[PDB]
């Protein structure tokens, strides 16, 4: 129990932090990855002067603060502001004292060696956690779907990745990163919806375009004869009621937004798209392992939640793969937390105890120890 | 949001009734004080005219 | 059943406010008429005593 | 007690001064904002030659003096004559010595920086008050209705304003000023009442048109089918008895006067009206704060006292606002003193002590100190 209860799992994202206790089924804490700094001197009624704001209080009060994102494209870019988000996570969100809890953290696919050593330096030397561990994100997603070999298409708020994993070892030279994700996708909907003849003028109009994207957006299979369908004008249309009455209608654009993930050309991106990239990762891997990867395309991440994403991907890679092959696109329902759940499982596991980096290892080996 | 909207509705209807009741009582106390005031003002003007004439 | 419960709540809150407002105005018109009535009664008794003495 | 008893609250208006002690429920002193200067040399029986007259003695003796209004449209226009009204307030009206009383003053919505510094210069350097503070008027009105975010429609004798306030900070760029108020409104009634076939000939006829406006005027909802009602001639009419017998009747015009506040066109004004202006203030503010402002339209000022003002405004903005919105027009009974009461509360408060500008702050920082 000492640490059975006690292991923490913190998944640091570009848009959201997911956090909680190893053992739980889902994150106890989910909140924006921002750190707000007040543009002016003054106070809220009853509070003192605050130097900084994090998560939702930074979002809610955004009009008087300069908002900053510590993690650009999955990589920690500002370490002063990240130690601020961690502090908030332990002390306010989970309300635990960190110096008696083992902490499993996550990093990104080709996270620079030096960063994995730096967050270890900050975990052990400024938070004084007993022990910690850094798992790679795609690797926890795979594992949370039971398996050990597969290829994960991972897509969240600032990055998309393909991480081919074989008997647990993520394959460095076959990993692909596509910098277009849910953030890019909300801003494109924004324009095709103002372009439908609308105005997201006040900040209460801006924010909810993102809630339109999440609730009403679709990834149609045969996106071709779906536009064609749009035109005959079926009961395909969908009206959402705004903060007030102002019933906005979205028929068609509803799927023009996730067609951006297959066609980056919709947004002036010259890069290849999700399905081709799944494939290219795969023809960059060893030959003998390619049947395995093909029958185990595990999807994880908030942006892979658009319904019919899996069917489109299913047919997208069948038709690029040699017919002798078995294609299989696994997309679980909890996928917006796969990464986290994979960490919860792993860290609560009976056999993981012997991989925890302890302060004994650290004080004796330097940050190098956990770096592997 | 409902048990909340119905509960707020019931409490405001209760408040409404209490205030509407307090009012029939204050507007009624009134026709009485205003009538007493006018009755005295007319007794006053009469005696003010009679004091002028005896003076 | 809701748009109905909320609509009934809003109409009764509106009614409640209208009556509560009509009341601050009638109870206030009051302190004024009762005070005017007392002020006149005292002017009356004074002139009633002065008419007696001039008579 | 030193200053718990001792804080003064002086609200300077275009028509009236409201004054008294922080702590009280209502102003101890209310009087016209005039300064009379005798047109001829001479005296009243038993008095000496008087150079000047202020408040009610200036109004009562107006036939031999040239009357002047120091505050034009809420802004202090003549500083020689204002120091005269302040002097009168402290020494004659409240009969206090100012050099041992902290003084909370009020200013108008976009009061020029230089004025807030000038009345501070006069408070500290010619009245020698221990400490002072200048609050913005709409902001005290809001606060006196308990809240901190809302939009105040403030309307008195020379100005109308809309001041959207968010967690206490009045929003400069969303404030609207409409120069038509109770003064304009008494003069319009005047004409529709002479136009009813009457004569307000002597000064005892002039003054009481204003007491007709206050006692008998109404703001009808559906001002349309209220004129229509006037014509069928119901027992809608209302006769007022003048200083003498001369019973004057006012049926209809009774509401034609406050319909001027929604239709400025009744008086050759091309500006928009109260309700549209409430609204425009609101579509000039941030988007995310517009649901707040809509559910918190606080009314203050002598001219917002016309019965049924709130119902007309209620329906005026519901029908301009998106139906998804909650409208809420708060109009308290003490509203002709909201501003003052908000100051009384605030200045008697336990936490305000640390915002008082003291002579220590001033003698050391210059007028800049209180200016903020």
From Swiss-Prot, chains A, D:
InterPro entries registered for this protein in UniProt: Actin, Actin/actin-like_CS, Actin_CS, ATPase_NBD
One GO cellular component term noted in the UniProt record for this chain: stress fiber
GO molecular function: actin monomer binding; ATP binding; calcium ion binding; calcium-dependent protein binding; cytoskeletal motor activator activity; hydrolase activity; identical protein binding; magnesium ion binding
Pfam families in alphabetical order: Actin
Residues recorded as bearing ADP-ribosylarginine in the entry: 177
Region (Interaction with alpha-actinin): 110-123, 358-370
Lineage per the UniProt record: Eukaryota, Metazoa, Chordata, Craniata, Vertebrata
Family membership: Belongs to the actin family.
Underlying gene: ACTA1
Main function: Actins are highly conserved proteins that are involved in various types of cell motility and are ubiquitously expressed in all eukaryotic cells.
Main localization category: cytoplasm
Organism: Oryctolagus cuniculus (Rabbit)
Protein name: Actin, alpha skeletal muscle
Keyword field contains Cytoplasm: yes
Extra remark: In vertebrates 3 main groups of actin isoforms, alpha, beta and gamma have been identified. The alpha actins are found in muscle tissues and are a major constituent of the contractile apparatus. The beta and gamma actins coexist in most cell types as components of the cytoskeleton and as mediators of internal cell motility.
PANTHER family: ACTIN (PTHR11937)
Modified residues (N6-malonyllysine): 61
EC number(s) given by UniProt: 3.6.4.-
Sorted UniProt keywords: Acetylation, ADP-ribosylation, ATP-binding, Cytoplasm, Cytoskeleton, Hydrolase, Methylation, Muscle protein, Nucleotide-binding, Oxidation
Entry keyword annotation includes ATP-binding: yes
Positions carrying N6-methyllysine: 84
PTM annotation: Oxidation of Met-44 and Met-47 by MICALs (MICAL1, MICAL2 or MICAL3) to form methionine sulfoxide promotes actin filament depolymerization. MICAL1 and MICAL2 produce the (R)-S-oxide form. The (R)-S-oxide form is reverted by MSRB1 and MSRB2, which promotes actin repolymerization. Can be mono-ADP-ribosylated on Arg-177 by SpvB of Salmonella spp. This modification blocks subsequent polymerization and leads to cell death.
Curated annotation (Swiss-Prot), chains B, C:
Top-level taxonomic group: Eukaryota
Location in or out of the cell: Cytoplasm, Cytoskeleton
Residue positions, PTM Phosphoserine: 12, 32
Sequence similarity: Belongs to the tropomyosin family.
Domain notes: The molecule is in a coiled coil structure that is formed by 2 polypeptide chains. The sequence exhibits a prominent seven-residues periodicity.
Subunit field text: Homodimer. Heterodimer of an alpha (TPM1, TPM3 or TPM4) and a beta (TPM2) chain. Interacts with HRG (via the HRR domain); the interaction contributes to the antiangiogenic properties of the histidine/proline-rich region (HRR) of HRG. Interacts (via N-terminus) with LMOD2 (via N-terminus) and TMOD1 (via N-terminus).
Function: Binds to actin filaments in muscle and non-muscle cells. Plays a central role, in association with the troponin complex, in the calcium dependent regulation of vertebrate striated muscle contraction. Smooth muscle contraction is regulated by interaction with caldesmon. In non-muscle cells is implicated in stabilizing cytoskeleton actin filaments.
Protein name per the record: Tropomyosin alpha-1 chain
Species per Swiss-Prot/TrEMBL record: Oryctolagus cuniculus
Organism taxonomic ancestry: Eukaryota, Metazoa, Chordata, Craniata, Vertebrata
Name of encoding gene: TPM1
Residues of the full protein shown: 175 to 229 of 284
């Amino acid at each position: 129990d000492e640490d059975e209860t006690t292991a923490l799992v913190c998944d640091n994202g570009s848009g959201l932090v997911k956090a909680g206790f190893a053992g739980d089924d889902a994150p106890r804490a989910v909140f924006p990855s921002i750190v707000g700094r007040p543009r002016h001197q003054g106070v809220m009624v009853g509070m003192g002067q605050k130097d900084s704001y994090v998560g939702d209080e930074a979002q809610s009060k955004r009009g008087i603060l300069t908002l900053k994102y510590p993690i650009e494209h999955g990589i920690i870019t500002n370490w002063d502001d990240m130690e601020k988000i961690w502090h908030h996570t332990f002390y306010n969100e989970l309300r635990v004292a960190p110096e008696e809890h083992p902490t499993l953290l996550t990093e990104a696919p080709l996270n620079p060696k030096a960063n994995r050593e730096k967050m270890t330096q900050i975990m052990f030397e400024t938070f004084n956690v007993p022990a910690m561990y850094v798992a790679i994100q795609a690797v926890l997603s795979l594992y949370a779907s039971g398996r050990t070999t597969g290829i994960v298409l991972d897509s969240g708020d600032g990055v998309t990745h393909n991480v081919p994993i074989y008997e647990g070892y993520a394959l460095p030279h076959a990993i692909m990163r596509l910098d277009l994700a849910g953030r890019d996708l909300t801003d494109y909907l924004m324009k095709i919806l103002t372009e439908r003849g609308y105005s997201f003028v006040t900040t209460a109009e801006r924010e909810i375009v993102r809630d339109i994207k999440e609730k009403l957006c679709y990834v149609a299979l045969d996106f071709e004869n779906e536009m064609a369908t749009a035109a005959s004008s079926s009961s395909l249309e969908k009206s959402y009621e705004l903060p007030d009455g102002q019933v906005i209608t979205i028929g068609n654009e509803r799927f023009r937004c996730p067609e951006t993930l297959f066609q980056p050309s919709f947004i002036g991106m010259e890069s290849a798209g999700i399905h081709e990239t799944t494939y290219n990762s795969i023809m960059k891997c060893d030959i003998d392992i390619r049947k395995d990867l093909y029958a185990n395309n595990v999807m994880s991440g908030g942006t892979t939640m658009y319904p019919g994403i899996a069917d489109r991907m299913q047919k997208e890679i069948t038709a690029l793969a040699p017919s002798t092959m078995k294609i299989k696109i696994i997309a679980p329902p909890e996928r917006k937390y796969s990464v986290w759940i994979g960490g919860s499982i792993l860290a609560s596991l009976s056999t993981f105890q012997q991989m925890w980096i302890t302060k004994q290892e650290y004080d004796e080996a330097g940050p190098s120890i956990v770096h592997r | 949001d409902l048990e909340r909207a119905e509960e707020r509705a019931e409490l405001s209807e209760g408040k409404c009734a209490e205030l509407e009741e307090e009012l029939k009582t204050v507007t009624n106390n009134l026709k009485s004080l205003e009538a007493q005031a006018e009755k005295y003002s007319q007794k006053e003007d009469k005696y003010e005219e009679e004091i002028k004439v005896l003076s």
